[PDB]
Design a protein around this ligand. Structure first.
Ligand code: 5DE
Ligand code: MG
Ligand code: ZN
Length: 326
């Protein structure tokens, strides 16, 4: 049909920063995670390399996508599809050419795919303060992140869902460790420590004459992949304004719902969660100045000069939001 044709046309931009992910979600019948993952797996030749039966891949991905909540405005299948595709573009950065193996590329993409699965739309601190079963289970540390990992891996055991069935036992062990390491690093309470170590690597940075990153041990390699997916998770303000504003609208809607829960329980309403006392534009400038820019400037330095266009878009967007403040 015309819908399938226009979908295939949008997917041609899968290697570009600024893919029309919302449009893809609409055209695919709300299956952006399934179709983008499938497209990326074919593009990187990941099915033949790891002998993943195509029917097995689709079955797992549709199941995975079903476990992201439709009624959660930001942390849903669209956010997952976006982080996956953003990770995919960062992996193709010239400074990282031939740096990671096929197993590490699969780990980073699969981790991005599951990184927020089954998100209930409330934060770690909210789950802790409300004496929830999740926080009780995970002893108050990376409560959501440990949960997203458990569900992402448990789903592989459903009928015809084990996409890793043809990997060796050692390959399975290695991928699992890498995925756990990456998803735990998406907990914002770890942001400051990741960034500091990223800056340390930037100072001691070793490269070839063409500027390709030389990363020999696990510690250095997993550190770059953790920051890569972390950067993808914090990529909304670096995308074309039309996309960023939509993400902003969704996170504010999610945060206000949490704030509405906090108000009726008699709790102190969390930052940016009070719809009656908000400053959406100031909060975005604050988000860029204190979190997103310091991270992306450091990443830019690691892969100089390949991230220059991403950084320019970030500063343009910051300038625009600032202008909306009287
Ligand atoms: C598009 C605008 O997004 C945000 O403002 C924002 C803030 C503030 N925190 N977060 C956020 C970042 C990382 C994680 N893991 C959860 C929430 C986002 C997306
Ligand atoms: Mg998360
Ligand atoms: Zn996320």
């Amino acid at each position: 049909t015309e819908q399938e044709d226009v979908l295939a046309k949008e997917l041609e931009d899968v290697n570009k920063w600024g893919l029309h992910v919302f449009r893809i979600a609409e055209l695919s019948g709300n299956r952006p995670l399934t179709v983008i993952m499938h497209t990326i797996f074919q593009e990187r030749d990941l099915l033949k390399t790891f002998k993943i039966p195509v029917d097995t891949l689709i079955t797992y991905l549709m199941t995975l996508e079903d476990h992201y909540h439709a009624d959660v405005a930001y942390h849903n299948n669209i956010h997952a599809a976006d982080v996956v595709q953003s990770t995919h573009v960062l992996l193709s950065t010239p400074a990282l050419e031939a740096v990671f193996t096929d197993l590490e590329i699969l780990a980073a993409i699969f981790a991005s795919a599951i990184h927020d699965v089954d998100h209930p739309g409330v934060s770690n601190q909210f789950l802790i303060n409300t004496n929830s079963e999740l926080a009780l289970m995970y002893n108050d540390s990376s409560v959501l992140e440990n949960h997203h990992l458990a569900v992402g891996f448990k789903l592989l055991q459903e009928e015809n869902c084990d996409i890793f069935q043809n990997l060796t036992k050692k390959q399975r062990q290695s991928l699992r460790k890498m995925v756990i390491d990456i998803v735990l690093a998406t907990d914002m309470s770890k942001h400051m420590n990741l960034l500091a170590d990223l800056k340390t690597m930037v100072e001691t940075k070793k490269v070839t004459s063409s500027g390709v990153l030389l990363l020999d041990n696990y510690s250095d390699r997993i550190q770059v992949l953790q920051n890569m997916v972390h950067c993808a998770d914090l990529s909304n303000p670096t995308k074309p304004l039309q996309l960023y504003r939509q993400w902003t609208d969704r996170i504010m809607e999610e945060f206000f719902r949490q704030g509405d829960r906090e108000r009726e329980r008699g709790m102190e309403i969390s930052p940016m969660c009070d719809k009656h006392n908000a400053s959406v534009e100031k909060s975005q400038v604050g988000f860029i100045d204190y979190i997103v820019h310091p991270l992306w400037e450091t990443w830019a330095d690691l892969v100089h000069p390949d991230a220059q266009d991403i950084l320019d878009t970030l500063e343009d967007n910051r300038e625009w939001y600032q202008s909306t403040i009287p």
